[PDB]
Amino acid sequence: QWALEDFEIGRPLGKGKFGNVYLAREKQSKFILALKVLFKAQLEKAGVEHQLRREVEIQSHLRHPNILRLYGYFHDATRVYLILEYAPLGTVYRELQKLSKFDEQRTATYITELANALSYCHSKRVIHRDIKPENLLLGSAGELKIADFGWSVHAPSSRGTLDYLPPEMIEGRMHDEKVDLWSLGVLCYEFLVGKPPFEANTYQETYKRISRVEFTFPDFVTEGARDLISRLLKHNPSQRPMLREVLEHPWITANSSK
Ligand SMILES: Cc1cc(Nc2nc(/C=C/c3ccccc3)nc3cc(N4CCN(C)CC4)ccc23)n[nH]1
Numbered sequence: 192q193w194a195l196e197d198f199e200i201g202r203p204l205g206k207g208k209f210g211n212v213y214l215a216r217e218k219q220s221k222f223i224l225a226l227k228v229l230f231k232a233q234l235e236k237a238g239v240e241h242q243l244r245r246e247v248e249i250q251s252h253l254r255h256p257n258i259l260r261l262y263g264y265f266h267d268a269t270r271v272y273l274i275l276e277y278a279p280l281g282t283v284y285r286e287l288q289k290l291s292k293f294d295e296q297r298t299a300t301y302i303t304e305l306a307n308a309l310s311y312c313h314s315k316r317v318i319h320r321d322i323k324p325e326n327l328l329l330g331s332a333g334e335l336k337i338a339d340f341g342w343s344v345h346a347p348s349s350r351g352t353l354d355y356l357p358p359e360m361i362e363g364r365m366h367d368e369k370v371d372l373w374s375l376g377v378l379c380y381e382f383l384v385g386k387p388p389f390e391a392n393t394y395q396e397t398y399k400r401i402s403r404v405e406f407t408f409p410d411f412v413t414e415g416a417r418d419l420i421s422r423l424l425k426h427n428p429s430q431r432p433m434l435r436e437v438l439e440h441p442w443i444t445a446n447s448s449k
Pocket residue numbers: 204205206207212225226227275276277278279280281282328338
């Protein structure tokens with residue numbers, strides 16, 4: 192059981208809607224950590240109150256070297272706070288902004304780790320759904336780490352921008368564990384190209400592109416990368432491979448890092 196007067200707040204790390212997240216230190220232990228505070232005001236004013244309590248509990252016991260740890264939570268009058276693992280090399284989103292694109296060795300590595308992190312998430316019937324670069328942080332070794340289980344869900348269910356969502360969920364419909372493999376294909380595409388495969392500039396253009404799986408590869412995406420991506424980006428879920436198989440796909444193996 193915790194309170195705010197047990198940590199001292201460092202610099203702000205980033206501000207989204209709901210609340211900000213700061214670097215922080217546990218006053219007793221001198222432990223370095225992240226402190227995402229979420230505003231109980233905007234929580235009642237967005238109805239995600241049941242989604243967060245779900246977010247907390249689910250990650251509150253997922254433990255994996257490529258999943259950000261949630262150590263605990265607490266609330267006061269105006270707000271609630273999550274006390275999170277601190278990942279010292281920032282977001283995958285920002286290193287993509289600064290590099291424009293990644294090379295094969297680098298993306299193959301990210302996909303590997305994310306596959307493993309996902310494979311584990313699956314082994315406890317947890318589907319993430321929202322796997323964009325903005326939820327991927329990097330730890331001390333530049334290893335990828337799945338943050339923000341804001342919209343994760345336990346078991347198959349029927350529950351922003353759609354660039355990362357699969358055809359299943361977009362057109363209503365029921366979805367399973369295979370949604371994250373769509374996401375993984377979308378991610379591997381954005382890692383290599385600099386934009387997700389279905390970027391457009393109005394929501395329904397993008398909806399149509401996803402709906403009919405419409406994407407092209409620029410010339411510099413290799414024979415091996417094109418295969419993998421086309422493999423995961425399948426309208427039909429069950430036609431998408433298993434995380435075991437993608438981990439073993441020769442372009443990943445030839446280019447990943449052990
Ligand atoms: C929860 C958590 C965050 C976190 N680490 C970091 N988060 C955010 C920014 C996060 C963010 C949050 C909301 C909105 C926008 C950004 N920015 C960061 C920037 C960092 N640096 C130092 C390393 N540099 C390469 C980039 C600037 C390092 C860690 C960061 N560890 N654990």
